[PDB]
Amino acid sequence: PMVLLECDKDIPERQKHIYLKAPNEDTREFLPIANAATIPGTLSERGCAFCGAKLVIGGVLKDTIQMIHGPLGCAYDTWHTKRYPTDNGHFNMKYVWSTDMKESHVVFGGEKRLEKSMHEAFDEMPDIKRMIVYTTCPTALIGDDIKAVAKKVMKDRPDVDVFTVECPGFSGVSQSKGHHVLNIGWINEKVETMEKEITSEYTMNFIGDFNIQGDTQLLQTYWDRLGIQVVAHFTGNGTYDDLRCMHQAQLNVVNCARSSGYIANELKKRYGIPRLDIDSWGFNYMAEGIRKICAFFGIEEKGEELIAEEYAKWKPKLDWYKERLQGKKMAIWTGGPRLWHWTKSVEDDLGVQVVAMSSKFGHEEDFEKVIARGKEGTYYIDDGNELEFFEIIDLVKPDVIFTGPRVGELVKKLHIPYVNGHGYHNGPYMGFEGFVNLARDMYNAVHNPLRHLAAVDIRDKSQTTPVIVRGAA
């Protein structure tokens, strides 16, 4: 049934957002409302639309200035917070750019301030030739025309190319609208503005993977072994110009259908490129995804050779962790898709029971997927807030929580360990090896002497201090 938590008695609209799956229900009658307005004052976990454009998608690129048109805080706040390495020295993580909007610019306009800042950025780093300009709350409100500015800068600097995103934080309700605006703008303005050499009979784009701790680079070892050319990664370890070539691919392989389904859908519509949805987290999921890709291309045997070698290399360690993680209870409190990518994969491959899930910004689509794959007795929460997390802990008593670091540091006080479900602990977590990495961190999180020590009150004469025996795969 839908659940009215005690902490939500005075915001009873939250009942429509929390589903406890029970036997024999027709789940179509119990789909959480999702992607609706946030309730003010709740300590919702949601971020802003600008975040979804710059931090999540655009800022992954290795060769692009990220020009944030606004006051300095939006820039400061999106710098030193992500773990998306590159193969060029992590340019994307080292720098952030602001137009340093001041009061004058609010009153009289910021277009000249943006123009000057763009020329300065290109002058300070002459080997960087690509830029994305983002609006933020106040530059949207005052109506600065960033597309016109970008057009002028490109006329004045024939060596550069600039893309613009109109993504103030108050757009939409969450990060999600930033994903949408960036996807649609990119396909409308930049796809089919360049081409690259095709060097394989088999070509694809990999859509919706952001190279967290090197995920994309690990998956690329598969594509290289299979002889498949990736035209563009959207956007993990990617380049601006590769994204201009996306119309050339034969296949679009989608992992993050939430942030990046939009562009896959438009590429299918405009160019006829099929959309294949996979799960690139999960051990047996990864095998299924490789088999689908190889079946599409007619290279089934190459796929079987790869899968056999990866199972021989990694399945024994995975099974060691499954033996020790069987029956452990997990919560997943992340953006949305990892709920449906992980609930059944940790169950199948690790024996782990996901007892509670919360999505910051998922849509009803995401809840359809997670509820289809998820257990009975589990809580499914749209746009969860901090007091709800405490009540859910009291209801389901998780052994481990996959969530962001700040919430991890909160639940530590309750003696509950965490794994960073966003930026990982010791990743990558995609692929065969990556699911072993995920399992290892879950194992070390839960089988942790400090948890046991913390429970002991040394003042209690009846208590001793235990020693715990651990293992390694």
Partner 1 sequence: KPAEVKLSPRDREGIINPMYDCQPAGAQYAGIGIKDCIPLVHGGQGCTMFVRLLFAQHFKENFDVASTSLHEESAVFGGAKRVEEGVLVLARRYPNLRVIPIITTCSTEVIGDDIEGSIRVCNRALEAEFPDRKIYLAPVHTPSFKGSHVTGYAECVKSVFKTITDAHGKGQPSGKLNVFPGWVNPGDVVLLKRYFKEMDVEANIYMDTEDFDSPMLPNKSIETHGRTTVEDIADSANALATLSLARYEGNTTGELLQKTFAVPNALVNTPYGIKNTDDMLRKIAEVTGKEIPESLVRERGIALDALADLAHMFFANKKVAIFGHPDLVLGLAQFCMEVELEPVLLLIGDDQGNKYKKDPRIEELKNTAHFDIEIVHNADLWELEKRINAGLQLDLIMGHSKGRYVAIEANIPMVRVGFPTFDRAGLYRKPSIGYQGAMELGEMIANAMFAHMEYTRNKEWILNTW
**Cβ–Cβ under 8 Å, residues 406 and 334:** no
Select from 11-19, 27-35, 65-73, 232-240 the region that touches ligand CLF (CB under 6 A).
65-73
Question: CB of residue 16 vs partner 1: minimum separation in angstroms?
Answer: 16
74 binds ligand CLF (CB under 6 A): yes
From 169, 208, 408, 427, residue interacting with ligand CLF (rule: CB under 6 A): 169
Handedness of CA 294, 84, 162, 52 (dihedral sign): positive
Cβ neighbors of 436 (< 8 A, separation 6 or more) are 283, 314, 317, 318, 321, 473
**Cβ–Cβ under 8 Å, residues 98 and 120:** no
**Cβ–Cβ under 8 Å, residues 38 and 44:** yes
168 binds ligand CLF (CB under 6 A): yes
Question: CB of residue 299 vs partner 1: minimum separation in angstroms?
Answer: 33
Q: Which does 217 bind (CB under 5 to 8 A by kind): ligand CLF, partner 1, none?
A: none
185 binds ligand CLF (CB under 6 A): no
d(C-alpha 196, C-alpha 465), whole Å? 64
- SS3 label, residue 160: coil
Which one, 136 or 183, has the nearer CB to ligand CLF?
Answer: 136
**Which residues ranging from 26 to 85 are in contact with partner 1 (CB under 8 A)?**
37-51, 67, 70-83, 85
137 belongs to an annotated ligand binding site: yes
Question: Which DSSP state fits 412?
Answer: G
Which one, 35 or 136, has the nearer CB to ligand CLF?
Answer: 136
Q: Which does 414 bind (CB under 5 to 8 A by kind): partner 1, ligand CLF, none?
A: partner 1
Cβ neighbors of 62 (< 8 A, separation 6 or more) are 86, 87, 88, 91, 92, 237, 238, 239
From 35, 174, 211, 343, residue interacting with partner 1 (rule: CB under 8 A): 174
422 belongs to an annotated ligand binding site: yes
From 20, 396, 407, 439, residue interacting with partner 1 (rule: CB under 8 A): 407
Which one, 82 or 344, has the nearer CB to ligand CLF?
Answer: 82
Handedness of CA 220, 222, 224, 230 (dihedral sign): negative
Q: Which does 413 bind (CB under 5 to 8 A by kind): ligand CLF, partner 1, none?
A: partner 1
Select from 31-39, 66-74, 150-158, 288-296 the region that touches ligand CLF (CB under 6 A).
66-74
256 belongs to an annotated ligand binding site: yes
**Which residues ranging from 263 to 292 are in contact with ligand CLF (CB under 6 A)?**
none
71 binds ligand CLF (CB under 6 A): yes
Question: CB of residue 108 vs partner 1: minimum separation in angstroms?
Answer: 12
69 belongs to an annotated ligand binding site: no
Question: CB of residue 92 vs ligand CLF: minimum separation in angstroms?
Answer: 18
Q: List residues bridging with 2 in a β-sheet.
A: 19
**Cβ–Cβ under 8 Å, residues 397 and 390:** no
Question: CB of residue 169 vs partner 1: minimum separation in angstroms?
Answer: 3
Question: CB of residue 72 vs ligand CLF: minimum separation in angstroms?
Answer: 6
59 binds ligand CLF (CB under 6 A): no
Handedness of CA 312, 314, 315, 320 (dihedral sign): positive
Q: Give the x-and-dash track for 130-149 against ligand CLF (CB under 6 A).
A: ------xx------------
Measured CA distances, 357 to 85, 396, 448 (Å) = 28, 11, 23
d(C-alpha 297, C-alpha 291), whole Å? 10
Q: How far is CA 237 from the centre of its chain?
A: 14
Question: CB of residue 172 vs ligand CLF: minimum separation in angstroms?
Answer: 11
- SS3 label, residue 68: strand
Helix axis angle for 300-325 and 431-446, nearest 10°, is 0
Select from 32-40, 70-78, 399-407, 438-446 the region that touches ligand CLF (CB under 6 A).
70-78
Q: Residues in contact with partner 1, total (CB under 8 A)?
A: 105
51 belongs to an annotated ligand binding site: no
The label of the residue with tokens 């060029």 reads 88
459 binds partner 1 (CB under 8 A): yes
335 binds partner 1 (CB under 8 A): no
3-state secondary structure 317-353: HHHHHHHHHCCCEEEEEECCHHHHHHHHHHHHHHCCE
Which is nearest to 190 in space by CA: 214, 165, 210, 226? 165
d(C-alpha 426, C-alpha 420), whole Å? 9
**Which residues ranging from 77 to 96 are in contact with ligand CLF (CB under 6 A)?**
77
Q: Residues in contact with ligand CLF, total (CB under 6 A)?
A: 11
For residue 234, give the H/E element and its range. Answer: strand 229-235
From 5, 34, 42, 50, residue interacting with ligand CLF (rule: CB under 6 A): 50
List, as residue ranges, the binding site.
48, 74, 137, 256, 422
List, as residue ranges, the binding site for [7Fe-V-9S-C-homocitryl] cluster.
256, 422
- Binding-site ranges for ligand CLF (CB under 6 A): 48, 50, 70-71, 73-74, 77, 136-137, 168-169
